[PDB]
């Protein structure tokens, strides 16, 4: 009888159940240990010197710290350009203002909101979420093509009179809303934005088109980031300070290890055609009989 490995696998049973935690002690998942695995019959050696654990903890520290050192770089850039201009900032966002108004207290509230936002930074925030489309698959040719289409010459009448017809006035902006009447900070916020054609400033609405109405509230402050990594930090009254976010003091494979945007493969219920309207999810559920 050439008896199968499956029956001796089951009848050999499982030795013991051992649970384990993660490093941050957030999840706690359990591990089985079957005796009839081939894990036993390879005769593995095992050892852990402490210097390797120290280097492992340092590498894991870097992997956790890449986001917060990016946020610290953002704060340093804010303070750098705020020292650089000399304290005089323009209004880059459309809001009607009054002249007789106390403005030193708005500066105090702006410093307060800046310290509060630095206290409550997280990996689920503006710059990380705006960075995730930049790490994608077709980002290189898309940015190259947008650069070439931006840097195209003035068209001659030949391509206007016989060539093909020519051709994104709104942008997908990401926002961190902080607020000091309640010390409530709001992290993952999406804002549709474009220019006001009557002037040269920006108009910020919802995806529904709400005309986002926190800018008139005197206590909030917002951080805006654009997909081309342009930077904005807007105190009430429409005045704001601008920069570029600088990530050049950071490694590349750390940025791809941490929050590189995901690419999916084909499972059941998915179109082998690329990009049609898919049907519903597979949805293996316990409410129904599982069929």
């Amino acid at each position: 009888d050439e008896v199968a490995r499956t029956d001796e696998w089951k009848g050999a049973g499982v030795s013991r159940l051992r649970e384990v935690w993660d490093v941050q002690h957030r999840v706690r998942l359990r591990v089985l240990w079957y005796v009839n695995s081939f894990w036993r019959s390879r005769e593995l050696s095992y050892d852990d010197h402490e210097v390797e654990l120290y280097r492992a903890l340092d590498a894991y520290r870097a992997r956790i710290a890449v986001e917060y050192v990016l946020i610290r770089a953002v704060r340093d850039e804010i303070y750098a350009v705020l020292r650089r201009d000399g304290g005089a900032l323009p209004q880059r966002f459309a809001c009607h203002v009054s002249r007789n108004m106390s403005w030193r207290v708005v500066w105090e509230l702006c410093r307060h909101a800046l310290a509060l936002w630095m206290d409550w930074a997280d990996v689920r925030s503006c710059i990380i979420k705006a960075l995730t489309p930049r790490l994608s698959r077709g980002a290189a040719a898309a940015a190259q093509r947008a650069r070439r289409q931006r840097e195209r010459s003035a068209p001659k009448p030949q391509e206007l009179l016989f060539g093909p017809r020519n051709e994104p006035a709104e942008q997908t902006w990401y926002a961190d809303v902080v607020r000091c009447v309640r010390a409530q900070v709001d992290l993952g916020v999406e804002v549709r934005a474009a220019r006001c054609p009557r002037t040269g400033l920006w108009i910020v609405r919802d995806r529904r088109g709400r005309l986002r109405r926190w800018l008139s509230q005197p206590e909030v402050c917002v951080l805006y980031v654009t997909p081309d990594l342009d930077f904005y930090w807007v105190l009430p009254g429409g005045f704001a300070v601008s920069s570029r976010v600088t990530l050049h003091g950071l490694a590349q494979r750390a940025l791809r290890d941490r929050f590189q945007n995901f690419e999916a493969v084909l499972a059941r219920g998915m179109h082998v055609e690329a990009g049609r309207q898919e049907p519903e999810t597979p949805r293996v559920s316990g409410r129904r009989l599982p069929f």
Binding site: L57, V69, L82, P90, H96, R111, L201, F239
Partner: protein, 66 residues
């Protein structure tokens, strides 16, 4: 009745008479070196692993003594 100003690209808010800019620079340089909010997570996991291995030393000193 209400009076206001229409926004522009040439209206500028000035520095707050450099009496609040200096405390802005103070808050800039008092937090260049401090809590980085990076090794706080390392602090938590080091404290927790240290508690774990110290309790393991307790189990070892309680059983291996017999």
């Amino acid at each position: 009745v209400a009076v206001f100003f229409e926004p522009h690209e040439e209206n500028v808010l000035r520095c707050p008479e450099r009496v609040l800019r200096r405390l802005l620079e103070d808050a800039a340089v008092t937090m260049r070196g401090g809590g980085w909010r990076e090794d706080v997570l390392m602090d938590r996991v080091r404290k927790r692993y240290l508690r774990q291995e110290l309790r393991d030393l307790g189990h070892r000193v309680q059983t291996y003594c017999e």
